[PDB]
Amino acid sequence: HEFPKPEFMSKSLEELQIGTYANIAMVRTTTPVYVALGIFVQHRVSALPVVDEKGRVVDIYSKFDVINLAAEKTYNNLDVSVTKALQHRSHYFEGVLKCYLHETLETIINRLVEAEVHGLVVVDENDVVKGIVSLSDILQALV
Amino acid sequence: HEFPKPEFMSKSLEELQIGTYANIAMVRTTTPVYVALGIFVQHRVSALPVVDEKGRVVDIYSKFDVINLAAEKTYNNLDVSVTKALQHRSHYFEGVLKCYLHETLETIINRLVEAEVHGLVVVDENDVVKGIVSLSDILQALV
Ligand SMILES: Nc1ncnc2c1ncn2[C@@H]1O[C@H](COP(=O)(O)O)[C@@H](O)[C@H]1O
Ligand SMILES: Nc1ncnc2c1ncn2[C@@H]1O[C@H](COP(=O)(O)O)[C@@H](O)[C@H]1O
């Protein structure tokens, strides 16, 4: 009974209707961590696209990023920028940040597993946010 | 304004009232992945304690575990056991599986960051499930 089904691994994100494409919560490179933490606790979404001055995705900020900040032995306050998370990892340069609607479920799954990341930002031709794909969305496709 | 606050890093899980201690969804070492996947998609919890024949915690099964299974190049079906996830990692032997109510937030945070894990099972003296602590619970303590 193969897991995952080969006929669904070969279908695109668009075809499978996988991800969230409305009401996306996101932040800027100039956003302090206190704003992200407020979003996580009060708005309750799992990952935040981080966009530069042009609206282009340059990182994804997760709840684990906050915990990583909290564990730092150097002195921090919450007025630190979300871009300080980049000292621990670069989702961007490892090619495990973004994805496209036309990409296959197999491609997306291989990308998640590549860096052990829980989410990808769906972008357009200008790297501008269209949606988000998280492990929950993939699990709905895997059923 | 220090992040995290030192006066809350020194407090225990019990003292901070961090974690979920009722209505815990969990599975057995004999549980097939199809049962875990159904739980994730329909019951909608982030991590499942995996308990042996004696009710003792021997693993934690996460949504990423399913994605990891899905990416395997060898042939699988969903009748595989949740214990096949153990081929990718041992939360147990790395000491990043369990925690106790009396442990400090700083200890718990350092443990999460140690293996880059998103959750811990709160256990008793017999390694039996008392609750679960996930990144969301920690974020509520960090505010
Ligand atoms: N920043 C976000 N804004 C809006 N929806 C999101 C965001 N991050 C994740 N989601 C969606 O939240 C749902 C649950 O995802 P998760 O919280 O990872 O289980 C999924 O459908 C995601 O696509
Ligand atoms: N297996 C589980 N059974 C019950 N509650 C859970 C389980 N896993 C996580 N939770 C709780 O679900 C809430 C949201 O956690 P998370 O889904 O990781 O954001 C937290 O209060 C967790 O303690």
Swiss-Prot record, chains A, B:
Sites bearing Phosphoserine, chain numbering: S81, S90
Residues reported to bind ATP 2: S62, K63, F64, D65, R89, L97, H118, G119
Disulfide bonds: none
PTM notes: Phosphorylated by ULK1 and ULK2; leading to negatively regulate AMPK activity and suggesting the existence of a regulatory feedback loop between ULK1, ULK2 and AMPK.
Superkingdom, taxonomy of origin: Eukaryota
Binding locations of AMP 2: S62, K63, F64, D65, R89, L97, H118, G119
Chain residues that bind AMP 3: T20, A25, S46, A47, H118, S134, L135, S136, D137
Binding site for ADP 2: S62, K63, F64, D65, R89, L97, H118, G119
Residue numbers carrying Phosphothreonine: T83
Limits of the CBS domain: 18-80, 92-143
Entry's family note: Belongs to the 5'-AMP-activated protein kinase gamma subunit family.
Role description: AMP/ATP-binding subunit of AMP-activated protein kinase (AMPK), an energy sensor protein kinase that plays a key role in regulating cellular energy metabolism. In response to reduction of intracellular ATP levels, AMPK activates energy-producing pathways and inhibits energy-consuming processes: inhibits protein, carbohydrate and lipid biosynthesis, as well as cell growth and proliferation. AMPK acts via direct phosphorylation of metabolic enzymes, and by longer-term effects via phosphorylation of transcription regulators.
Assembly and oligomerization: AMPK is a heterotrimer of an alpha catalytic subunit (PRKAA1 or PRKAA2), a beta (PRKAB1 or PRKAB2) and a gamma non-catalytic subunits (PRKAG1, PRKAG2 or PRKAG3). Interacts with FNIP1 and FNIP2.
Domain notes: The AMPK pseudosubstrate motif resembles the sequence around sites phosphorylated on target proteins of AMPK, except the presence of a non-phosphorylatable residue in place of Ser. In the absence of AMP this pseudosubstrate sequence may bind to the active site groove on the alpha subunit (PRKAA1 or PRKAA2), preventing phosphorylation by the upstream activating kinase STK11/LKB1.
Protein name: 5'-AMP-activated protein kinase subunit gamma-1
Source organism of this protein record: Homo sapiens (Human)
Classification lineage: Eukaryota, Metazoa, Chordata, Craniata, Vertebrata
